[PDB]
Amino acid sequence: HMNNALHAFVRSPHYRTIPSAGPNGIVVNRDMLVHQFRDFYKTLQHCSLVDKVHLMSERPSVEALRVADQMVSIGATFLEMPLTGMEHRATEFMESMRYVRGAGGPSTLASYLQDTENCRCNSGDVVCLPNGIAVGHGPRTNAVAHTTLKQLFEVKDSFDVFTLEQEGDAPPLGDYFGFAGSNVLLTWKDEHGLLAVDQYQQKQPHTEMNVVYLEPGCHFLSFYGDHTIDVLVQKGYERSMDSIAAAGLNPIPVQWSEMDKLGISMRAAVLPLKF
């Protein structure tokens, strides 16, 4: 066991402003929610995924829990997202950057995507792979972003940038499509994961991939980068947990019902910074 130098920033929920119901109308239990987040923070603390967990101060909007939206880390680059859809979150991202700097992190973030005209990109649509990234193309991440990410990182000699075309109702790619261990592909069993898997296996047909089919809705957390086998799995998805352990991985159950109902994946609630 060795320390991966990965730092995870999260923001605790503001109890007073937790909505009573999620975007679809299902009931949300704020007492359960703050319970689950404290347990989630403690789970991140003792596992192989991250090294150090940093808690950030409360803000009066449940959107501020989506700390992953601010940036994505590709290699040693901390790539800022364009603010075209989230101008109202500038002051939040700001405050988050003070926590990053205070922990010994970067002084600034790379502004390539912010300096590129008409570039739309969502951090969840970028998924880190063995020697490259898979980027979803669809309702959040447009083709300029794919063009820009390729010139930023693609190396044909190798670092691949796979474009995976998404349907209009696809969630961010990383919510249902991920990597674990050395060569394990994690994907949801719905139209979105199955399409992404069909596309990715054609673009990379040379290294055979162990595809693990999770149940649709099974929130999971695993970022490739030591090939640790720890994968956070939403508590309640029994068969998914079986599928993950059937592939030599370590499924770690996390109670996530209330953040699930809020529309916030575990991935969205953790800002992982590859120091």
Author numbering: 6 to 162, 166 to 233, 235 to 284
Give passages from the manuscript.
Kinetoplastid protists such as Trypanosoma brucei undergo an unusual process of mitochondrial uridine (U) insertion and deletion editing termed kinetoplastid RNA editing (kRNA editing). RESC5 is a key core component in forming the foundation of the RESC complex. Similar knockdown studies revealed essential roles for RESC5 (formerly called MRB11870) in kRNA editing; cells depleted of RESC5 exhibited 80–90% decrease in edited mRNAs and 2–4 fold increases in pre-edited mRNAs.
The only differences are in two surface exposed loops (residues 18–34 and 159–167), which appear flexible. DALI searches revealed the RESC5 structure shows the most significant structural similarity to proteins belonging to the superfamily of arginine-glycine amidotransferases (3.75.10.10), with the strongest homology to dimethylarginine dimethylaminohydrolases (DDAH) of this superfamily. Examination of the superimposition of RESC5 onto DDAH revealed that the catalytic cysteine and histidine are not conserved in RESC5 and are replaced by alanine and proline residues, respectively.
